Amino acid sequence: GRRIQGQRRGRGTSTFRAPSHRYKADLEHRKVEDGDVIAGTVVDIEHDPARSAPVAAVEFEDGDRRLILAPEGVGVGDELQVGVDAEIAPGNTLPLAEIPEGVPVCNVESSPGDGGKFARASGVNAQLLTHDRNVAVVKLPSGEMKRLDPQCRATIGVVGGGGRTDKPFVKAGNKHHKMKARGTKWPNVRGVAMNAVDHPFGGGGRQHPGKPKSISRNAPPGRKVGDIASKRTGRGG
Amino acid sequence: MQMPRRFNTYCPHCNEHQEHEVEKVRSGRQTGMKWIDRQRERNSGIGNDGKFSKVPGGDKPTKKTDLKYRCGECGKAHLREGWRAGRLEFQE
């Protein structure tokens, strides 16, 4: 047979790539020598094409102009601060250690300085639970408890644009326009709707997968489709 | 069928009739150093290994008699034609 669609993806061709050249900025936390003195003002709120959410334009004291992952509640004129001594208000960035337990946070760094990795999508937020001199326990939106270096910087508040998922696309057309702003091939043809040659589920006089749909983790690419290493399926029980 | 464990009969070594003792040939064990063993190691490689990759044979519904005739006096054994027999039990 032929490579299945998952295998074409890997190749990173035009069809599969994301319109990078159309993206605005790689939202990352600033780098501060130390002191925390670093502060800046919100100059404007712009739409981020890569995340379908708002992004804040900020002018820092030392002349630096950069876009920032804006939490809900940030407006023009506001003053944001970044550093160990930053005040504890929404929009400000400071290590998990300096953050008070029980406070919602977003755009968390996995390892100090990486610039933030966790909780950055629409309306999500992490939950700083436990402190320590060694470990900072944070609950990520997936519900997982993430043990982190209390040095990892994070932003106070919840990511802007919450509720996006509450409204249905309603029509293909609307998915279409969104999909075009992402690195994804759309629409999706069902395997079972293809020919044997094209997908392990293809073929037959009627549509139905050939074998069961749960596949082993060890399955090779080309065969790994359907329910991947599923721990269970269905709703019952 | 039944078969006496001992009985008189010609001994090709002694060259005269004497009491022989019958036993079922116990399968010897291999050294794994014969020529054929080396060829298998030597000749097997990437892909199908030819003969050494073959599918196992079958079995006849009944096997022939596989015995040893041990001479009671000179102690030297001798082999005979076997004959199909579903089962062979010695008497005493």
Binding site: - | G45, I46, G47, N48
Partner: protein, 194 residues
């Protein structure tokens, strides 16, 4: 009396022992941050180089080369192949790493010719060899009664034709008797059977 050199040699017989052991542990760290081909002012194994033909003279260059360890980096078949040839993992090239090194080095110095090469250790994935190269255009070498032979035109690109040290050994030309039926006077002339 033992030459000072004889010590350099003695030490390298067991490159994982004593002082040289700690030297490698030290060097390799710098080596792993170095390039594929780095010229070096002096041979790490003086005895070795000199023994091979080295001389602290004008027109003689030495360079350390890093080659990946292991079997051949091979791409699986994209068309019909009988089992025997569906091979990928266990296939190994017929040219030893040292010889690859010699070539890589030589290409980096297009005007120079390979004289000989030697090993200088290896970590978990690299293998380093030092190659001695010669400028067949620099007098002093043209005028050296012990190397001027490499200036001859007949020697243009010795490595690429396997006229090297490891070249001839790799071509199975070591023995003069039994075993070299398909080796001498050349693999190609023997229909490529060794």
């Amino acid at each position: 009396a033992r030459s000072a050199y004889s010590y350099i040699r003695e030490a390298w017989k067991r490159p994982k022992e004593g002082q040289i052991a700690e030297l490698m542990w030290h060097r390799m760290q710098e080596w792993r941050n170095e390039p594929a081909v780095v010229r070096i002012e002096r041979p790490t194994r003086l005895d070795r180089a000199r023994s091979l033909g080295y001389k602290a003279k004008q027109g003689i260059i030495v360079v350390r080369v890093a080659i990946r360890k292991g079997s051949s980096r091979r791409t699986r078949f994209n068309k019909g192949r009988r089992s025997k040839r569906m091979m990928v993992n266990r296939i190994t090239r017929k040219k030893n790493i040292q010889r690859i090194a010699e070539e890589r080095a030589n290409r980096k110095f297009p005007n120079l010719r390979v004289l000989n090469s030697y090993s200088v250790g290896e970590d978990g994935r690299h293998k380093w060899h030092e190659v001695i190269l010669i400028d067949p255009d620099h007098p002093a070498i043209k005028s050296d009664d012990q190397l001027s032979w490499i200036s001859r035109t007949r020697h243009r690109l010795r490595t690429f034709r396997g006229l090297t040290s490891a070249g001839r050994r790799c071509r199975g030309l070591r023995g003069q008797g039994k075993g070299s039926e398909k080796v001498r006077p050349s693999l190609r002339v023997n229909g490529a059977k060794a």
